């Protein structure tokens, strides 16, 4: 039972019908045997365990793809973006609800895939991607070369990651429930992104009229947040 | 400080002790402010009481056990010049003015201590660069002659 | 200089054990000697004060009790390449030390001589705890000589003994330089009365002087 | 047992030794039979249940008194001042710890009195006190006429309110623990002040040297805060 | 229970209130399994188990520190100084009672620290310290460079040794109870000093009048002495 209703935010959709626990793992808090992680991680309630619905991206016929690095997509937004700019640690899974509303006369297939540690590559140069090439924020980024996922490795094999297909014939939605995917128990949100929600239209959008401006709406819920404490009792 | 420079990776709680060393008549206040890492160091006393602090009146109370949660850090090297960023601060602002009588000295002092708790740990032992021979030691060949 | 940080996930206190802190085979002596047959051999009074890395690390403690596990690493350099036999004779307190390469003290049956070649693996002997007090006074607040204006801070008991290394071979047509690296791993270490770490640089190996 | 250690803030004094539960009432949260008070009052933890130590006021010989209206003293300060500027309701008792550090060669007596609903009066005019005459904030205000408490009613009878005496011969501190003192169950912090911490030096400061600049330090801990919700689930 | 009353000597102070068993070890006699130590160590009674009160050192503002090497401080004094000049062995712990009498208008902090095997260093030369630079006796010595304890190692870390703080605000006294601190079971008093009572004023003395000549009085009680026999029965 999923119930897309987290905190004050909620998504009253009808046709969701399934979600993908990424790598079979539900997001949880930091386990109690990992006390090494500084002694006070606060466990914030639904101040940050809520859906942060981004801009609806305008999916046309000639669109290559979209990528939002998490939690870079939410470092400027709301009570998660406030807590990132004060806390240096965090440990949060994510619930992503991508749905692409369209009529029964639209066609297409989105590979809504969540890529752990999507180290991007630049095209046709040996210089590494800069800070402004990687850390985009609320707008996210567009794939330059989506067949190689902008890191030289194939889109055809990108279903090895947690993914769901928005085939506009069958379903309009995709819900991917991300656990804490890191080697470290907690991590640093302003300079590291564990996941990358990548939405790649494999089959492009098609209709006989002018190029259809079908929106894809992304809602990212940081489930089971933790952070730095900042309210510790110095005795 | 110096034993954690024999080890690369180190993590654990510390424990400060600020002993006041003025006269017995000398009264006043301090505000000892633990800034967590990532936060900004307080510049004014108004910013200092917003965060974690402890308003310490030195009346009969002349020492403050101050538990610091989990100062960690290590050394780094990339493809050096890579240190730990910051593990926070412990700042101290004058809350009041110092009050001494006409016979006690106008200038009073503070001694600060630092200790680790039982959860402090060290690993990947290295060589401490606090010492180093550059030219010679005197009668170093006397162990051979 | 960039400023990074990482979550330090550790577990255990076993690496900070004093047995684990000091038992590293540190280089304690290294000199070269020309050979043609000191007069062309290697002798060295075993102390830990030769290199400041192990010295400050051992001057964290007042009293130490260890079996020094000396590993004589010998390399050779010709001024054809010969195969050589060496003798790392360990000379304790009381037994006499050689002054020449061919003295009568190298053939002493009571000294713990070890005969090894360069083409062999390095010679390793475990010199036991031979202080006659129950621990090595790293700092000896006191005098050896009884009210004598001699030398301060030298314990008469803490003498390990000279480690004397020669080449057992006789005269050879090539002259060559032999560098003897002595590696000491102290082990079975007990340590008493920890001390402040030294901040100022050393001035001599005989004492605890400082310049500031 | 008081233990002046609330949240990340703490006051390590030695000579406190007593506190005054104001009107015999310890501050508590909103009781559960008062559901009328909108259904979601959040009960914030030690983010606001902490000591907010004000400026130390410079008590000289010619000082008349000081007054801090609560919670006007804390509407610009910290996580209470942030929550006031977003939440329209609140329900908070207060713990006040006034201590006046001085040597054994100083003299004086402070009536550290906490006045519920201290409707001030202006002197020698019929115009009511303005917004800037009442709402001062972190600095507080100085009594113009402390013998009549700036509302025409006597200082001599002002011990009918919860009060403690800082007689610098005997004690340097006063601790007054204020309950929720209002007719309404919750109230409005930007335009109403339930309590007024009034510190009136009845016996002025005295020493043979120059006019002694003895500080009086006020630390106000808003115990048992509530507020507006703002995180309600709209189903 | 300490009871600073050893032999005919006694110290009737009032504010002592604590002592420091150095390295957690109370001084005892030579244990019976160490018979190697020549067969006749006499166990002298309170002839030497008594307080030998030295000169009171005149602690001014510009004083760096004082050090008494034990038992060099007592080799010329009394029944311990007589027994040292006849017996070649000894095995004695020490009870040191340093107290620094001052008014409530004085300030300062003494690191009364007892350093085992304080091998001193000379400043700015490679010659070792002589016999007259180390063995001082009843007068003791003054620290040349107390920040490095006259052996290059830091004063800031010198609390690793057994120490007590005479903070003249809080206490005037320090009592350090030293065990037998040597690798050898017995030792030689005319040419070796196990302990060094070091009194370093970290915070200097301060008062508004002329430079205050506050005395620091040191009383060293050689607890649990042993010596050479000299009265053995040659059968």
TrEMBL record, chains A, D, E:
Places the protein is found: Host cytoplasmic vesicle membrane; Host nucleus; Virion
Upper taxonomic lineage: Viruses, Riboviria, Orthornavirae, Pisuviricota, Pisoniviricetes
Name this protein carries in UniProt: Genome polyprotein
Full protein stretch here: 82 to 316 of 2188
Family to which the UniProt record says this protein belongs: Belongs to the picornaviruses polyprotein family.
Function: Acts as a primer for viral RNA replication and remains covalently bound to viral genomic RNA. VPg is uridylylated prior to priming replication into VPg-pUpU. The oriI viral genomic sequence may act as a template for this. The VPg-pUpU is then used as primer on the genomic RNA poly(A) by the RNA-dependent RNA polymerase to replicate the viral genome. During genome replication, the VPg-RNA linkage is removed by the host TDP2, thereby accelerating replication.
Assembly and interaction partners: Interacts with protein 3CD.
From TrEMBL, chain C:
Localization per Swiss-Prot or TrEMBL: Host cytoplasmic vesicle membrane; Host nucleus; Virion
Superkingdom of origin: Viruses
Role noted for this protein: Protein 3CD: Involved in the viral replication complex and viral polypeptide maturation. It exhibits protease activity with a specificity and catalytic efficiency that is different from protease 3C. Protein 3CD lacks polymerase activity. Protein 3CD binds to the 5'UTR of the viral genome.
Family: Belongs to the picornaviruses polyprotein family.
Subunit structure: Interacts with capsid protein VP1 and capsid protein VP3 in the mature capsid.
Protein name: Genome polyprotein
Species: Human enterovirus D68
Lineage: Viruses, Riboviria, Orthornavirae, Pisuviricota, Pisoniviricetes
Part of the intact protein present: 606 to 833 of 2188
């Amino acid at each position: 039972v999923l119930q897309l209703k987290l905190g004050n935010s909620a998504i009253v959709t009808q046709e969701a019908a399934n979600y993908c626990c990424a790598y079979g793992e539900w997001p949880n808090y930091l386990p109690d045997h990992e006390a090494v992680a500084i002694d006070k991680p606060t466990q914030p309630e639904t101040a940050t365990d809520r859906f942060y619905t981004l801009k609806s991206v305008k999916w046309e016929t000639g669109s290559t793809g979209w990528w939002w690095k998490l939690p870079d997509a939410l470092n400027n937004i709301g009570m998660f973006g406030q807590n990132v700019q004060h806390h240096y640690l965090y440990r949060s899974g994510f619930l992503i609800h991508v749905q692409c509303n369209a009529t029964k006369f639209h066609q297409g297939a989105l590979l809504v895939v969540a890529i752990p540690e999507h180290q991007r590559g630049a095209h046709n140069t040996n210089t590494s991607p800069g800070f402004d090439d990687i850390m985009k924020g609320e707008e996210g980024g567009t794939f330059n070369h989506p067949y190689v996922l902008d890191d030289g490795t194939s889109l055809a094999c990108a279903t090895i990651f947690p993914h769901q297909w928005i085939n506009l014939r069958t379903n309009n939605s995709a819900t991917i429930v991300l656990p804490w995917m890191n080697a470290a128990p907690m991590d640093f949100p302003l300079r590291h992104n564990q996941w990358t929600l990548a939405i790649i239209p494999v089959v492009p959008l098609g209709t006989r009229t002018t190029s259809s401006m079908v929106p894809i709406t992304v809602s990212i819920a940081p489930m089971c947040c933790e952070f730095n404490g900042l309210r510790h009792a110095i005795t | 400080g110096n034993i954690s420079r024999y080890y690369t990776h180190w993590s654990g709680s510390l424990e400060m002790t600020f002993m006041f060393c003025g006269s017995f008549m000398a009264a006043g206040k301090l505000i000892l402010c633990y800034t967590p890492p990532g936060g900004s160091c307080p510049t004014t006393r108004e910013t200092a009481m917003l965060g974690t602090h402890i308003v310490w009146d030195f009346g009969l109370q002349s020492s403050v056990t101050l538990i610091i949660p989990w100062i960690s850090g290590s050394h780094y090297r990339m493809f050096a010049k890579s240190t730990n960023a910051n593990v926070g601060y412990v700042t101290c602002f004058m809350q009041t003015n110092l009050i001494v009588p006409s016979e006690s000295s106008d200038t009073c002092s503070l001694i600060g201590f630092i200790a680790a708790k039982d959860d402090f740990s060290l690993r990947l032992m290295r060589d401490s660069p606090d010492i180093g021979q550059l030219d010679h030691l005197h009668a170093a060949e006397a162990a051979y002659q | 200089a960039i400023q990074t940080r990482t979550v330090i996930n550790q577990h255990g206190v076993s690496e900070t054990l004093v047995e684990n802190f000091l038992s590293r085979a540190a280089l304690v002596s290294k000199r070269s000697f020309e050979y043609k047959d000191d007069k062309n051999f290697f002798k060295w009074t075993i102390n830990t004060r030769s290199f400041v890395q192990l010295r400050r690390k051992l001057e964290l403690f007042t009293y130490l009790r260890f079996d020094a596990e000396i590993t004589i690493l010998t390399t050779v350099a010709v001024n054809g390449l010969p195969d050589l036999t060496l003798q790392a004779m360990f000379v304790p307190t009381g037994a006499l030390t050689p002054e020449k390469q061919d003295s009568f003290h190298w053939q002493s049956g009571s000294n713990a001589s070890v005969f090894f070649k360069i083409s062999d693996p390095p010679a390793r002997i475990t010199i036991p705890f031979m202080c006659i007090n129950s621990a090595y006074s790293v700092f000896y607040d006191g005098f050896a000589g009884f009210e004598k204006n001699g030398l301060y801070g030298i314990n008469p008991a803490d003498t390990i003994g000279n480690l004397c290394v020669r080449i057992v071979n006789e005269h050879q047509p090539v002259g060559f330089t032999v560098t003897v690296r002595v590696y000491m791993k102290p082990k079975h270490i007990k340590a008493w009365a920890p001390r402040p770490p030294r901040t100022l640089p050393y001035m001599s190996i005989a004492n605890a002087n400082y310049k500031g």
